[PDB]
Design a protein around this ligand. Structure first.
Ligand SMILES: Nc1ccn([C@@H]2O[C@H](COP(=O)(O)OP(=O)(O)OP(=O)(O)O)[C@@H](O)[C@H]2O)c(=O)n1
Ligand SMILES: C[S@@+](CC[C@H](N)C(=O)[O-])C[C@H]1O[C@@H](n2cnc3c(N)ncnc32)[C@H](O)[C@@H]1O
Ligand code: SF4
Ligand SMILES: [Mg+2]
Ligand SMILES: [Mg+2]
Length: 284
């Protein structure tokens, strides 16, 4: 079966923000108790996991859990790469002082350098850019690789962000085409409806061309993003995106990694093509 080399653990669906396009919505509030999460991460390490990305939901709503799992993954499991993806609003310098030795990469999601755009998207109330520059400084102080995540959508796809990227200098800048997932952001009935925010393949290509001088840019059109991730939900079930859905396997805590992965689609050619294997720690 497939080797789960790089895994996203969406350990909670709770979030403090209202992004209109969110594709991983607040449909539950279950979080595994730490002994269960540690068991799951151990099974993944044994299956060949080298990199773990803590996601959600907003991970910094759970600093006690997140700190425990980061320290366990780096100190006990000896993973090559421990990363977090965050909206940045609840990141405190004290967390980076306490756990920063165990954090390889911190990714901050910021879709625009124009505050009126961040407000229209639902990601903040006007302080996202100032917070992003402060987190960038903290990553330099505590020796953490600084990563920026941008969702390219109808509200920001015409924006020129070169001047801010030249000041921030993230080692890695993910540019995601906004993606529709059935049961998350596709319906009148879901917690979000992203259909008004979608862009064409040509609009996404023009965004990337506008930023051709940024060597850190990692573009992810829908064809590369949809099925190229190994996604563990808040019950440590793999989510299968074959349908354009997020259909859960059995928990790795019930059937093990191999049985859970067996009937999950993971497009390894797409994963390699988007740059899923990279220099993901400081010694790289
Ligand atoms: N159909 C999909 C595809 C991706 N994602 C999520 O989108 C996020 C993308 O964040 P990113 O920073 O790309 O994740 P990493 O795995 O850390 O990226 P990399 O290792 O390439 O730096 C991940 O949490 C991933 O699980 C999702 O929820 N549904
Ligand atoms: C769901 S968030 C979870 C982590 C954290 N709450 C955050 O926003 O960074 C994970 C990543 O997916 C991005 N994202 C969310 N919805 C998306 C969508 N519909 N299409 C593409 N990327 C999306 C986010 O902006 C973020 O970089
Ligand atoms: S993308 Fe926005 S709404 Fe979705 S989990 Fe991250 S901050 Fe929350
Ligand atoms: Mg570090
Ligand atoms: Mg150009």
């Amino acid at each position: 079966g497939q080797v789960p080399v790089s895994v996203n653990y969406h350990f909670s669906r709770k979030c403090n923000k209202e992004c209109l396009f969110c594709f991983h919505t607040a449909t539950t509030s279950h979080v595994e108790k730490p002994e269960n999460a540690k068991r799951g991460l151990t099974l993944l390490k044994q299956a060949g996991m080298k990199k773990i990305n803590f996601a959600g939901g907003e991970p910094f709503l759970y600093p006690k859990f997140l700190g425990e799992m980061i320290d366990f993954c780096k100190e006990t499991l000896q993973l090559e790469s421990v990363s977090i993806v965050t909206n940045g609003s609840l990141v405190k310098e004290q967390f980076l002082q306490k756990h920063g030795r165990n954090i390889d990469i911190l990714a901050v999601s910021c879709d625009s350098f124009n505050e009126a755009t961040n407000i229209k998207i639902g990601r903040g109330s006007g302080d996202n850019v100032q917070k992003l520059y402060e987190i960038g400084s903290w990553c330099q102080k505590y020796d953490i690789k600084f990563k920026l995540n941008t969702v390219v959508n109808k509200f920001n796809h015409l924006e020129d962000m070169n001047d801010h990227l030249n000041a921030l200098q993230p080692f890695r800048w993910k540019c995601f085409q906004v993606l529709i997932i059935e049961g998350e952001n596709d319906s009148d009935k879901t917690l979000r409806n992203a259909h008004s925010l979608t862009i064409s393949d040509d609009e996404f290509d023009r965004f990337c061309e506008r930023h051709s001088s940024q060597t850190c840019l990692v573009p992810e059109p829908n064809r590369l993003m949809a099925k190229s991730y190994l996604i563990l939900d808040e019950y440590m079930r793999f989510l299968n995106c074959t349908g354009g859905r997020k259909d859960p396997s059995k928990s790795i805590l019930e059937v093990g990694v191999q049985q859970a992965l067996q009937a999950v689609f993971w497009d390894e050619e797409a994963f390699v093509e988007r740059g899923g294997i990279y220099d993901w720690n400081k010694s790289s």
